[PDB]
Design an enzyme around this catalytic site. Structure first.
Site, PDB file in Angstrom:
ATOM      1  N   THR B  91       0.826  -1.221   0.000  1.00 48.93           N
ATOM      2  CA  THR B  91       0.000   0.000   0.000  1.00 48.93           C
ATOM      3  C   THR B  91       0.864   1.277   0.000  1.00 48.93           C
ATOM      4  O   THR B  91       0.634   2.214  -0.777  1.00 48.93           O
ATOM      5  CB  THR B  91      -0.972  -0.024   1.205  1.00 48.93           C
ATOM      6  OG1 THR B  91      -1.883  -1.124   1.048  1.00 48.93           O
ATOM      7  CG2 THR B  91      -1.759   1.279   1.300  1.00 48.93           C
ATOM      8  N   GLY B 101       2.288   9.056 -10.249  1.00 45.42           N
ATOM      9  CA  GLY B 101       2.103   8.885 -11.702  1.00 45.42           C
ATOM     10  C   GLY B 101       0.873   9.618 -12.233  1.00 45.42           C
ATOM     11  O   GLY B 101       0.899  10.264 -13.306  1.00 45.42           O
ATOM     12  N   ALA B 113       0.233  12.103   3.474  1.00 43.92           N
ATOM     13  CA  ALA B 113       0.023  11.934   4.918  1.00 43.92           C
ATOM     14  C   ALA B 113       1.103  11.041   5.515  1.00 43.92           C
ATOM     15  O   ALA B 113       0.902   9.828   5.703  1.00 43.92           O
ATOM     16  CB  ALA B 113      -1.351  11.335   5.193  1.00 43.92           C
ATOM     17  N   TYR B 144       5.278  -0.641   8.407  1.00 45.79           N
ATOM     18  CA  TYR B 144       4.712   0.711   8.389  1.00 45.79           C
ATOM     19  C   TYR B 144       5.793   1.818   8.404  1.00 45.79           C
ATOM     20  O   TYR B 144       5.758   2.748   7.590  1.00 45.79           O
ATOM     21  CB  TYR B 144       3.759   0.863   9.580  1.00 45.79           C
ATOM     22  CG  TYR B 144       3.072   2.208   9.732  1.00 45.79           C
ATOM     23  CD1 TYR B 144       1.932   2.514   8.985  1.00 45.79           C
ATOM     24  CD2 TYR B 144       3.514   3.154  10.661  1.00 45.79           C
ATOM     25  CE1 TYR B 144       1.265   3.739   9.135  1.00 45.79           C
ATOM     26  CE2 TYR B 144       2.839   4.398  10.821  1.00 45.79           C
ATOM     27  CZ  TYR B 144       1.714   4.670  10.046  1.00 45.79           C
ATOM     28  OH  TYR B 144       1.034   5.879  10.199  1.00 45.79           O
TER      29      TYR B 144
HETATM   30  N1  NAD Z   1      -4.547   9.459  13.031  1.00 43.80           N
HETATM   31  C1  NAD Z   1      -3.245   9.494  13.306  1.00 43.80           C
HETATM   32  O1  NAD Z   1      -2.813   9.687  14.589  1.00 43.80           O
HETATM   33  C2  NAD Z   1      -2.165   9.362  12.287  1.00 43.80           C
HETATM   34  C3  NAD Z   1      -0.813   9.489  12.678  1.00 43.80           C
HETATM   35  C4  NAD Z   1       0.189   9.395  11.693  1.00 43.80           C
HETATM   36  C5  NAD Z   1      -0.184   9.183  10.373  1.00 43.80           C
HETATM   37  N2  NAD Z   1      -1.513   9.073  10.017  1.00 43.80           N
HETATM   38  C6  NAD Z   1      -1.851   8.790   8.606  1.00 43.80           C
HETATM   39  O2  NAD Z   1      -3.047   9.415   8.164  1.00 43.80           O
HETATM   40  C7  NAD Z   1      -3.763   8.533   7.307  1.00 43.80           C
HETATM   41  C8  NAD Z   1      -5.181   8.304   7.856  1.00 43.80           C
HETATM   42  O3  NAD Z   1      -5.108   7.637   9.107  1.00 43.80           O
HETATM   43  P1  NAD Z   1      -6.411   7.315   9.984  1.00 43.80           P
HETATM   44  O4  NAD Z   1      -6.029   7.514  11.390  1.00 43.80           O
HETATM   45  O5  NAD Z   1      -7.565   8.057   9.392  1.00 43.80           O
HETATM   46  O6  NAD Z   1      -6.611   5.689   9.813  1.00 43.80           O
HETATM   47  P2  NAD Z   1      -7.742   4.826   9.053  1.00 43.80           P
HETATM   48  O7  NAD Z   1      -7.334   3.400   9.161  1.00 43.80           O
HETATM   49  O8  NAD Z   1      -9.058   5.153   9.601  1.00 43.80           O
HETATM   50  O9  NAD Z   1      -7.728   5.388   7.554  1.00 43.80           O
HETATM   51  C9  NAD Z   1      -6.979   4.762   6.513  1.00 43.80           C
HETATM   52  C10 NAD Z   1      -7.912   4.531   5.326  1.00 43.80           C
HETATM   53  O10 NAD Z   1      -7.162   4.036   4.225  1.00 43.80           O
HETATM   54  C11 NAD Z   1      -7.880   2.927   3.653  1.00 43.80           C
HETATM   55  N3  NAD Z   1      -6.923   2.035   2.988  1.00 43.80           N
HETATM   56  C12 NAD Z   1      -5.948   1.245   3.561  1.00 43.80           C
HETATM   57  N4  NAD Z   1      -5.252   0.601   2.592  1.00 43.80           N
HETATM   58  C13 NAD Z   1      -5.804   0.980   1.396  1.00 43.80           C
HETATM   59  C14 NAD Z   1      -5.538   0.611   0.076  1.00 43.80           C
HETATM   60  N5  NAD Z   1      -4.561  -0.233  -0.260  1.00 43.80           N
HETATM   61  N6  NAD Z   1      -6.283   1.184  -0.938  1.00 43.80           N
HETATM   62  C15 NAD Z   1      -7.301   2.080  -0.655  1.00 43.80           C
HETATM   63  N7  NAD Z   1      -7.607   2.434   0.638  1.00 43.80           N
HETATM   64  C16 NAD Z   1      -6.856   1.879   1.637  1.00 43.80           C
HETATM   65  C17 NAD Z   1      -8.611   2.271   4.828  1.00 43.80           C
HETATM   66  O11 NAD Z   1      -9.679   1.400   4.441  1.00 43.80           O
HETATM   67  C18 NAD Z   1      -9.010   3.504   5.639  1.00 43.80           C
HETATM   68  O12 NAD Z   1     -10.290   4.000   5.284  1.00 43.80           O
HETATM   69  C19 NAD Z   1      -2.943   7.243   7.213  1.00 43.80           C
HETATM   70  O13 NAD Z   1      -2.141   7.264   6.039  1.00 43.80           O
HETATM   71  C20 NAD Z   1      -2.062   7.278   8.435  1.00 43.80           C
HETATM   72  O14 NAD Z   1      -0.871   6.522   8.249  1.00 43.80           O
HETATM   73  C21 NAD Z   1      -2.500   9.159  10.962  1.00 43.80           C
HETATM   74  O1  UDP Z   2      -2.995   8.393 -14.435  1.00 42.99           O
HETATM   75  C1  UDP Z   2      -2.220   7.513 -14.027  1.00 42.99           C
HETATM   76  C2  UDP Z   2      -0.924   7.408 -14.524  1.00 42.99           C
HETATM   77  C3  UDP Z   2      -0.111   6.376 -14.052  1.00 42.99           C
HETATM   78  N1  UDP Z   2      -0.530   5.495 -13.076  1.00 42.99           N
HETATM   79  C4  UDP Z   2       0.413   4.475 -12.566  1.00 42.99           C
HETATM   80  O2  UDP Z   2       1.530   5.180 -12.037  1.00 42.99           O
HETATM   81  C5  UDP Z   2       2.714   4.432 -12.279  1.00 42.99           C
HETATM   82  C6  UDP Z   2       3.915   5.369 -12.264  1.00 42.99           C
HETATM   83  O3  UDP Z   2       3.782   6.363 -13.269  1.00 42.99           O
HETATM   84  P1  UDP Z   2       5.067   6.845 -14.107  1.00 42.99           P
HETATM   85  O4  UDP Z   2       4.703   8.017 -14.944  1.00 42.99           O
HETATM   86  O5  UDP Z   2       6.213   7.041 -13.184  1.00 42.99           O
HETATM   87  O6  UDP Z   2       5.434   5.515 -14.927  1.00 42.99           O
HETATM   88  P2  UDP Z   2       5.551   5.200 -16.477  1.00 42.99           P
HETATM   89  O7  UDP Z   2       4.419   5.763 -17.252  1.00 42.99           O
HETATM   90  O8  UDP Z   2       6.836   5.761 -16.951  1.00 42.99           O
HETATM   91  O9  UDP Z   2       5.601   3.727 -16.547  1.00 42.99           O
HETATM   92  C7  UDP Z   2       2.460   3.698 -13.594  1.00 42.99           C
HETATM   93  O10 UDP Z   2       3.176   2.484 -13.693  1.00 42.99           O
HETATM   94  C8  UDP Z   2       0.950   3.501 -13.620  1.00 42.99           C
HETATM   95  O11 UDP Z   2       0.573   2.170 -13.307  1.00 42.99           O
HETATM   96  C9  UDP Z   2      -1.802   5.627 -12.554  1.00 42.99           C
HETATM   97  O12 UDP Z   2      -2.214   4.842 -11.683  1.00 42.99           O
HETATM   98  N2  UDP Z   2      -2.629   6.628 -13.046  1.00 42.99           N
END
Ligand code: NAD
Ligand code: UDP
Ligand code: NAD
Ligand code: UDP
Ligand code: UDP
Ligand code: UDP
Lengths: 312, 312
Positions: B91, B101, B113, B144
């Site tokens: 993630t 991108g 964030a 993380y």
């Molecule tokens: N609240 C805090 O104290 C704190 C501190 C440091 C950093 N942050 C950052 O702020 C952001 C929000 O945190 P939060 O406290 O709201 O937690 P949260 O878990 O409620 O929010 C994270 C959201 O991201 C979504 N998510 C996770 N993986 C995903 C993926 N692969 N694709 C799409 N969505 C995905 C989850 O479903 C969730 O809704 C995070 O990036 C966190 O690392 C928060």
């Molecule tokens: O509108 C966009 C453009 C790109 N990508 C993704 O972002 C990555 C990184 O983009 P970048 O321009 O660096 O890569 P490139 O086009 O050179 O492969 C790509 O591999 C895509 O999978 C995306 O999700 N949305």
């Protein structure tokens, strides 16, 4: 005998590892995109029944059947890893994920070529495997330093969650034959400047330190680690530490050169000292370096003298 | 008025940011996979002409047209980010690359964030943006910590090489309404234990420290940073620091509870102290937190008392 993949196998270290494993009778596949390596480094094996070379970028998915993977693909010289920071980051992150995915599917053991740079600009001495490091996450070297730190994290995540057998080597500064003339690292720069009578270019005052290892020692360590039962990180390096000004003076002496030593600007975020603790490798693998520094440097000088002839 | 994407917009912080930007008249798209967030957090905007919710995992490519991207997608609670370390790492790495991108292609400004965890177990106090951190690259929290450090590195690589406009927020511990009952972070755990008369579970001795901020203060800071001309990292947090035992005692008092305080095992690699330096945000943005700790905690207690009713 085993089926073995080496990513980055056409580079400096990878080409020497290829030689050892081919001599021992294994079936070796090399994967490389020739960003910093070259076909010339492995051309002597092309045509052998147990060898294949594949032109392939590790950021793209790869589906083959092997028993072991030595993962060495990344730019390694600071001027070359800072050339294009996006390329460096993608190689270390996406590339490592793809190779762990392969290991999971086919049941292969994977070894990661990590780096002493995970320790950053150190605040303990020497550096043992229990030290967490001091690294700038947003400076000009971070594309490499942070890329390698997160690659280690990825290996341990796949071991714990998916049962992948992993090995991690933290490699300290290594030199030898087959390095590119324009590589930009210190041993190749100083040897070539000295050979041509040009100024040796010291970056900063030259009081910063490093500890250098000959390539054959590194290769023996990598094979010992791969075939051990030790999964936690192991430092592979030579513990003999000197200043960069001392290294310039030594190279000038071994070459027999009249080159001036000149002092230029410092490198940004340059680590100020480095010395490996190798007790773990000694006790768990029975390994230590056996090639003295002067013997190794003389082998490297011979290589570059030949190269300047291959030009002139 | 602007077209704005919020990844992780159905989570705790993201849902409050969605509310602010919709009230101000912008066109807002939320992307979330509901790993830790939920549709219920943004359901009040579903059907509005200026709102869209998309079920999408950021590790998969996304092609839309927007002016700004707030990138919040990641698990955030230690039990939930350590649940599946491979998911957490993918993630933060692949997800961030895909969003950069997108920003490059359409000419959008992106805000990351990031986290106080980039500082690790600190060896300076308070923590300002010039500190490099002290972080274990292979411990149980590294999926993380290292994922977030390398995400920062990626943003600066795209700014330098491709001209992408980037903003980086280092967020300190934030609490408020809409947190899940089983989230596992300390403010939600202690409030729910106290409300039910169950033991408050202190991990270790309780001498470790944290500094807590109410969610509305964080949201105002995120919008100020996005619309500024400051591209280097900025800490967003409340500088008021206390011990975890002091926090347990305060929550017990504000709830009016007879719960016992119990002492369990320490968390592995738990940071021992934390306090943000926010001089940079004050001088460059004119921003500071304005909600007192007790006022914020009372708003959170009200939310959880209602939730336990939505169960019973
Ligand atoms: N609240 C805090 O104290 C704190 C501190 C440091 C950093 N942050 C950052 O702020 C952001 C929000 O945190 P939060 O406290 O709201 O937690 P949260 O878990 O409620 O929010 C994270 C959201 O991201 C979504 N998510 C996770 N993986 C995903 C993926 N692969 N694709 C799409 N969505 C995905 C989850 O479903 C969730 O809704 C995070 O990036 C966190 O690392 C928060
Ligand atoms: O509108 C966009 C453009 C790109 N990508 C993704 O972002 C990555 C990184 O983009 P970048 O321009 O660096 O890569 P490139 O086009 O050179 O492969 C790509 O591999 C895509 O999978 C995306 O999700 N949305
Ligand atoms: N030699 C050292 O002192 C040292 C120190 C620490 C770490 N290491 C590590 O050991 C490995 C080998 O280093 P080296 O000194 O032989 O440098 P090198 O540059 O000669 O070798 C790296 C090889 O990887 C290839 N490569 C780069 N990106 C690739 C990609 N995306 N896909 C496929 N191939 C790619 C290059 O073309 C090259 O052949 C590197 O991972 C490096 O980080 C070396
Ligand atoms: O033989 C393989 C198997 C997988 N992969 C890549 O490795 C990545 C990670 O593999 P993993 O098993 O974690 O991913 P999944 O199959 O669950 O998507 C995948 O996305 C593939 O692109 C590869 O290059 N070679
Ligand atoms: O022409 C050069 C090349 C490098 N160095 C210095 O030598 C040390 C080792 O540099 P190298 O690039 O070989 O390795 P790394 O910094 O990755 O350890 C560093 O302090 C460099 O600044 C130098 O003084 N002159
Ligand atoms: O039930 C709990 C939950 C957490 N903590 C501690 O409270 C602090 C803050 O934990 P949280 O998960 O909220 O945030 P983070 O560690 O990410 O700052 C840490 O020292 C935890 O070990 C605790 O004592 N009891």
């Amino acid at each position: 005998r085993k089926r073995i993949l080496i990513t980055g196998g056409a580079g400096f270290v990878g080409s020497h590892l290829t030689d050892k494993l081919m001599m021992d009778g294994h079936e070796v596949t090399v994967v490389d995109n020739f960003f910093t390596g070259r076909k010339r480094n492995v051309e002597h094996w092309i045509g052998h029944e147990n060898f294949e070379l594949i032109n392939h970028d590790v950021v793209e998915p790869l589906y083959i059947e092997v028993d072991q993977i030595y993962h060495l693909a990344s730019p390694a010289s600071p001027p070359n890893y800072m050339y294009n920071p996006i390329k460096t980051l993608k190689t270390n992150t996406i590339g490592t994920l793809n190779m762990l995915g392969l290991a999971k599917r086919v049941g292969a053991r994977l070894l990661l070529a990590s780096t002493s740079e995970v320790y950053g600009d150190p605040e303990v001495h020497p550096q043992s495997e229990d030290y967490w490091g001091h690294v700038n996450p947003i400076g000009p070297r971070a594309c490499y330093d942070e890329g390698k730190r997160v690659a280690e994290t990825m290996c341990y995540a796949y071991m714990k969650q998916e049962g992948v057998e992993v090995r991690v080597a933290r490699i300290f500064n290594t030199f030898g034959p087959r390095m590119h003339m324009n590589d930009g690292r210190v041993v190749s720069n100083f040897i070539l400047q000295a050979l041509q009578g040009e100024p040796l270019t010291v970056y900063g005052s030259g009081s910063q330190t490093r500890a250098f290892q000959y390539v054959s020692d590194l290769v023996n360590g990598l094979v010992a680690l791969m075939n051990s039962n030790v999964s936690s990180p192991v430092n592979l390096g030579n513990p003999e530490e000197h200043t960069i000004l001392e290294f310039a003076q030594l190279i000038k002496n071994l070459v027999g050169s009249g080159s001036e030593i000149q002092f230029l600007s410092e490198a940004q975020d340059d680590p100020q000292k480095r010395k490996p603790d190798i007790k773990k490798a000694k006790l768990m693998l029975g390994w230590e370096p056996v090639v003295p520094l002067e013997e190794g440097l003389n082998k490297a000088i011979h290589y570059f003298r030949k190269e300047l002839e291959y030009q002139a």
